């Protein structure tokens, strides 16, 4: 990125804000993987829309600046014939 | 000898108050350090295993002795004869002159190292440690040795239990990962 600053679409902002202030709801899908993780966002688990299937993702304290959608690879491995 | 005087005045009296002792006089004592070489030959034809033996004279002044194998191995050389590695058993005033170099100089020199030895205790007494660089010992020159050879240290405690053996080491100033 650059400066001022990391950019969530902003709906995730109010969502995680309301989820932080109250309710403590867990597991929620999102199509907007472009959004970066935030300190207020910590500890939540989001189903990430790779396209084929949502992949749930827990948020450790260590991850912030990495993109939220980065953790789930759309790519399928490998695929190769004769292993070993 | 400064380390030797140190437990005669500082460590012991503090160690005495930490818990009770039968017959007052009893106190755990360091016995012997055993430094291993191993070398690994790779394979048998070093060709000079003795050149590694000369290197250990720098780490400690006691003369190293090659450890001849007492058993053959199918996976690696060799049947009895043609010794693998070397061993040293420094004692007396040499013991604390060497340990003083270990805490003050050797261990901090290592790159990634910050602290080790947690599960390392036998539950009986003896401490163990691994050493992977000659850079760790100041007396060795960088120009010598070139290729790295491995090293070991095994401090011995008189104490019958690891809980006493550990507490003795902490007052010596021995590092722990915690």
């Amino acid at each position: 990125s650059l400066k001022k600053g990391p950019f969530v679409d902003g709906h995730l902002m109010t969502k995680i804000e309301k989820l932080n202030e109250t309710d403590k709801k867990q597991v929620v899908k999102t199509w907007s993987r472009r959004s970066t993780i935030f300190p207020q966002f910590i500890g939540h688990t989001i189903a990430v829309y790779d396209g084929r299937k949502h992949v749930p993702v827990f948020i450790s304290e260590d991850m912030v600046g990495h993109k939220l959608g980065e953790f789930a690879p759309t790519r399928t491995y490998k695929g190769h014939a004769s292993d070993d | 000898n400064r380390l030797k005087e140190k437990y005669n005045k500082e460590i012991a009296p503090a160690l005495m108050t930490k818990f009770n002792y039968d017959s007052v006089m009893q106190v755990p004592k360091i016995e012997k350090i055993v430094i291993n070489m191993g070398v690994g030959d790779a394979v048998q034809n070093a060709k000079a295993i003795d050149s590694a033996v000369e290197e250990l004279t720098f780490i400690a002044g006691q003369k190293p002795v090659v450890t001849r194998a007492k058993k053959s191995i199918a996976g690696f050389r060799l049947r009895e004869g043609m010794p693998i590695g070397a061993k040293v058993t420094l004692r007396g005033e040499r013991m604390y002159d060497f340990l003083d170099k270990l805490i003050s100089v050797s261990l901090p020199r290592v790159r990634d190292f910050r602290g080790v030895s947690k599960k390392s205790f036998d539950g009986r007494g003896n401490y163990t440690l691994g050493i992977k660089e000659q850079l760790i010992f100041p007396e060795i020159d960088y120009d010598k040795v070139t290729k790295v050879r491995g090293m070991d240290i095994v401090i011995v405690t008189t104490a019958n239990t690891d809980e006493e053996a550990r507490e003795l080491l902490t007052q010596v100033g021995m590092p722990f990962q915690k």
């Binding site: 993702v57 953790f71 690879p73 | 290592v110 790159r111 020159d141 960088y142």
Partner: protein
């Protein structure tokens, strides 16, 4: 051996001689020597008995060989336990920065060999 960065060589001028240090590069050497005022000096290794020490201190401020290796190691270990995707590229043999795979990129893949035919 040696006084600053461990195992600096011999019979070479001081700047390239401490570029070999796992930490300082070329321009950083230009900076530490700019602080030094040595002027190069010395082609071999003969600096000065105390100036070698004051340079040893400035180099000591910079950090640090195998611990710097521990920096990159702890960093990539941070990059694998985090999930992940970047360390995933670090251990697939996949290039990490993002530059295909359909051709070349053998820096991690290695040379040999081949296991396919048609028809």
């Amino acid at each position: 051996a040696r006084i600053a960065g461990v195992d600096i060589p011999r019979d070479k001028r001081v700047v390239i001689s401490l570029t070999y240090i796992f930490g300082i590069g070329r321009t950083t050497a230009q900076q530490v020597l700019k602080e030094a005022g040595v002027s190069e000096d010395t082609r071999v290794r003969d600096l000065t008995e105390e100036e070698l020490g004051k340079i040893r201190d400035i180099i000591d401020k910079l950090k640090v060989e195998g611990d710097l290796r521990r920096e990159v190691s702890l960093n990539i270990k941070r990059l694998i336990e985090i999930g992940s995707y970047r360390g995933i590229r670090h251990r697939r043999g996949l290039p990490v920065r993002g530059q295909n795979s359909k051709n070349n990129a053998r820096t991690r893949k290695g040379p040999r060999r081949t296991v396919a035919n048609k028809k």
